[PDB]
Design a protein around this ligand. Structure first.
Ligand SMILES: OC[C@H]1O[C@@H](O[C@H]2[C@H](O)[C@@H](O)[C@H](O[C@H]3[C@H](O)[C@@H](O)[C@H](O)O[C@@H]3CO)O[C@@H]2CO)[C@H](O)[C@@H](O)[C@@H]1O
Ligand code: NAG
Ligand code: CL
Ligand code: CL
Ligand code: CL
Ligand code: CL
Ligand code: CL
Ligand code: CL
Ligand code: CL
Ligand code: CL
Ligand code: CL
Ligand code: CL
Ligand code: CU
Length: 235
């Protein structure tokens, strides 16, 4: 159970974005139904009044939290990967529009899942804004908690992989459009019951065998990291 509080741009806090520039759901409950429209931008997908201005090459940092800002972030039970996707805002996340900018599953040298590292990073993870067409975009941050993912939701609706999905409204202002945005995948639709990474047993299968759900990260993506960039406590 986790939610996005807001974002930072180039290490600068853009302020509380809940229902402002984040299409926030009413609570931190997971989405589990892979076929539901809730997969796109969670359960209250609507236009919110603000969209955060950034330029290509900026660092955009999502900040997550559990109950209050900079708290335990997400229960440490919730081991799993983290991905960020982008689509143009005009799609409203419909269609084959979602392009992967970032993927982190398990780090063998540190022996930590992306979620493990997100807690250490005080809820913060980032992507570098790509050289896509200027315009309005949705950035869809997705955490998959795998602690009940030995079952499939479709088969047993009290279990299954859990998706903590948050869509940020982001306006790319300065960009040369030198890496125009390629074809995307649909959410819902990209993840199905046979998709690698959706059904997995973290308690018996080595984490080093884990493979995250495709698609693979776009070659045009400029980078990203799970790491604290700013200190909320001074805010
Ligand atoms: O059910 C067994 C699993 O529980 C996991 O904990 C979650 C609880 O199941 C869930 O009810 C609780 O939801 C809270 C939420 O955390 C809180 O922020 C919100 O205000 O109220 C919700 C309840 O209405 O979330 C916790 C996770 O934080 C365990 O992590 C898991 O190991 C366990 O097997
Ligand atoms: C999953 O979502 C689909 C599409 O909205 C819906 O028909 C189905 O009823 C959902 N499953 C459950 C258990 O709610
Ligand atoms: Cl949970
Ligand atoms: Cl609810
Ligand atoms: Cl659901
Ligand atoms: Cl709906
Ligand atoms: Cl605005
Ligand atoms: Cl808060
Ligand atoms: Cl960190
Ligand atoms: Cl540029
Ligand atoms: Cl697909
Ligand atoms: Cl980064
Ligand atoms: Cu939870």
């Amino acid at each position: 159970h986790t939610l996005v509080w807001g974002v930072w741009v180039n290490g600068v806090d853009q302020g509380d974005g809940r229902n402002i520039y984040i299409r926030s759901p009413p609570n931190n409950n997971p989405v589990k139904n892979l076929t539901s429209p809730d997969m796109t931008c969670n359960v209250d997908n609507r236009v919110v009044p603000k969209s955060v201005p950034v330029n290509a090459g900026d660092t955009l940092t999502f900040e997550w939290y559990h109950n209050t800002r900079d708290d335990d972030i997400i229960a440490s039970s919730h081991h799993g990967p983290i991905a960020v996707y982008i689509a143009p805002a005009a799609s409203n996340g419909q269609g084959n529009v979602w392009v992967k900018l970032f993927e982190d599953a398990y780090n063998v040298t540190n022996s930590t899942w992306a979620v493990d590292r997100l807690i250490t990073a005080h809820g913060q993870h980032s992507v570098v804004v790509p050289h896509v067409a200027p315009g309005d975009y949705l950035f869809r941050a997705e955490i998959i908690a795998l602690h009940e993912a030995d079952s499939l939701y479709s088969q047993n609706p009290i279990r299954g992989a859990q998706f903590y999905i948050s869509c940020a409204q982001i306006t790319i202002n300065s960009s040369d459009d030198s890496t125009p945005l390629p074809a995307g995948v649909p959410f819902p639709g990209a993840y199905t019951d046979s998709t690698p990474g959706i059904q997995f047993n973290i308690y018996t299968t080595p984490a080093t065998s884990y493979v995250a759900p495709p698609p693979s990260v776009w070659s045009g993506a400029l980078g990203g990291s799970i790491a604290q960039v700013g200190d909320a406590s001074l805010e």
